[PDB]
Amino acid sequence: DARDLTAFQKNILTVLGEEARYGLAIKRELEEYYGEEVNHGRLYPNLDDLVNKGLVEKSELDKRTNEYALTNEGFDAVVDDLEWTLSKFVADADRRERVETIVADDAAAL
Amino acid sequence: DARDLTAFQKNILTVLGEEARYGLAIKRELEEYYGEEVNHGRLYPNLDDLVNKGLVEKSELDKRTNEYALTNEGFDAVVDDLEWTLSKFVADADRRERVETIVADDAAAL
Ligand SMILES: [Br-]
Ligand SMILES: [Br-]
Ligand SMILES: [Br-]
Ligand SMILES: [Br-]
Ligand SMILES: [Br-]
Ligand SMILES: [Br-]
Ligand SMILES: [Br-]
Ligand SMILES: [Br-]
Ligand SMILES: [Br-]
Ligand SMILES: [Br-]
Ligand SMILES: [Br-]
Ligand SMILES: [Br-]
Ligand SMILES: [Br-]
Ligand SMILES: [Br-]
Ligand SMILES: [Br-]
Ligand SMILES: [Br-]
Ligand SMILES: [Br-]
Ligand SMILES: [Br-]
Ligand SMILES: [Br-]
Ligand SMILES: [Br-]
Ligand SMILES: [Br-]
Ligand SMILES: [Br-]
Ligand SMILES: [Br-]
Ligand SMILES: [Br-]
Ligand SMILES: [Br-]
Ligand SMILES: [Br-]
Ligand SMILES: [Br-]
Ligand SMILES: [Br-]
Ligand SMILES: [Br-]
Ligand SMILES: [Br-]
Ligand SMILES: [Br-]
Ligand SMILES: [Br-]
Ligand SMILES: [Br-]
């Protein structure tokens, strides 16, 4: 089970939950999240880890260019954590309203 | 900015987002999440870190032992992470419906 992944690894899965992405695209999505540079030497060993764990699939479209996507197991890991997080966050009606507004605004911005 | 916290520290904040809790209660909420024992020596040094970071506040009680709660900044950190997670997860209408259903079912259980 994926509840023991690092925050960095979990953030990779969150990025790929949006859509499959090239490795370099994952890097810049994480940099936008952290507000700090993400080194290749940290990203790609962690991607390899997630592939070995069966949570991410790697596709070598060309040389130097790899595309990564969640497996169903990786998607389950994303949903599992989101469900646990929401189980704790939705503690009353005000919390429910906040989350519902976040979701509706995100869907409207698609 | 608390986006650099470890997953363990972020999970502490998630637990306290549900409600203020005694230290021992935090530990069992984390153990139910992880499905493994959480040692005293992992929990309390990290509670200390979160207090020093201004994300958690501590109160010594006369009924049990010690109660921890999110500060305003700690709540902001939980909301911020949830907002980012949802910004990636709510990627089409089906994802929107899934989260709406998670929230609705969590609210029904209150
Ligand atoms: Br795993
Ligand atoms: Br971590
Ligand atoms: Br990390
Ligand atoms: Br995390
Ligand atoms: Br891409
Ligand atoms: Br790219
Ligand atoms: Br590397
Ligand atoms: Br391939
Ligand atoms: Br090509
Ligand atoms: Br790439
Ligand atoms: Br699969
Ligand atoms: Br699962
Ligand atoms: Br989550
Ligand atoms: Br859950
Ligand atoms: Br309320
Ligand atoms: Br409610
Ligand atoms: Br609220
Ligand atoms: Br409402
Ligand atoms: Br709101
Ligand atoms: Br911080
Ligand atoms: Br951790
Ligand atoms: Br409690
Ligand atoms: Br306690
Ligand atoms: Br304890
Ligand atoms: Br207790
Ligand atoms: Br659980
Ligand atoms: Br304090
Ligand atoms: Br989250
Ligand atoms: Br966001
Ligand atoms: Br939609
Ligand atoms: Br879905
Ligand atoms: Br019901
Ligand atoms: Br009902």
Side-chain angles (χ1 to χ4, degrees):
Chain A
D1 179 75
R3 288 183 177 191
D4 56 4
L5 295 170
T6 65
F8 187 81
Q9 292 169 337
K10 297 173 59 178
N11 288 336
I12 293 171
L13 298 179
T14 297
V15 166
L16 297 178
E18 190 181 26
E19 60 194 67
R21 294 206 177 274
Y22 304 149
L24 184 58
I26 300 171
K27 207 161 95 61
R28 61 173 169 268
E29 292 291 334
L30 295 167
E31 287 183 338
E32 185 167 1
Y33 171 78
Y34 288 113
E36 301 169 345
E37 289 190 273
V38 174
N39 194 267
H40 75 275
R42 185 182 191 195
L43 173 54
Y44 283 99
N46 277 280
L47 283 171
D48 183 66
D49 292 334
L50 294 170
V51 170
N52 294 333
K53 292 175 183 296
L55 307 180
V56 176
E57 174 186 2
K58 182 183 70 178
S59 297
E60 303 178 2
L61 311 178
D62 317 308
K63 193 186 173 181
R64 303 177 175 183
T65 300
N66 299 326
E67 187 178 63
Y68 300 86
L70 291 181
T71 67
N72 185 65
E73 193 174 354
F75 179 71
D76 285 352
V78 174
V79 173
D80 172 75
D81 238 50
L82 180 59
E83 290 175 336
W84 184 73
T85 293
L86 291 171
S87 80
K88 299 299 170 184
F89 187 82
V90 184
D92 55 40
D94 284 342
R95 296 284 187 83
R96 171 216 61 198
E97 176 182 40
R98 181 191 289 273
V99 175
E100 292 185 346
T101 297
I102 293 168
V103 173
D105 284 354
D106 289 342
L110 295 177
Chain B
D1 188 4
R3 292 184 172 187
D4 294 329
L5 293 175
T6 69
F8 186 79
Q9 294 170 330
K10 292 196 176 196
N11 288 335
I12 293 171
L13 296 182
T14 299
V15 166
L16 296 175
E18 189 184 24
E19 66 191 50
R21 292 209 177 277
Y22 302 102
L24 184 62
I26 300 174
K27 215 171 73 67
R28 63 175 165 265
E29 291 284 345
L30 293 171
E31 285 182 344
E32 182 166 5
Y33 171 79
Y34 287 116
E36 300 172 3
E37 294 186 16
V38 173
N39 296 329
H40 190 281
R42 200 190 184 193
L43 175 57
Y44 283 90
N46 282 281
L47 280 172
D48 298 348
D49 291 341
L50 290 173
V51 171
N52 285 328
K53 292 171 180 288
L55 306 170
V56 172
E57 46 194 340
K58 173 185 178 184
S59 303
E60 182 180 2
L61 269 174
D62 190 9
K63 292 181 179 179
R64 295 203 180 277
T65 291
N66 288 332
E67 177 167 282
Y68 301 84
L70 294 181
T71 63
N72 290 327
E73 187 176 356
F75 177 78
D76 294 343
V78 171
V79 171
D80 175 66
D81 226 84
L82 181 53
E83 277 169 351
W84 184 74
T85 291
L86 288 174
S87 81
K88 299 304 188 179
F89 190 84
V90 184
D92 55 43
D94 290 330
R95 296 277 188 90
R96 188 195 78 237
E97 295 171 5
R98 182 188 286 265
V99 181
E100 293 170 356
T101 298
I102 294 166
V103 172
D105 294 347
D106 288 348
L110 295 176

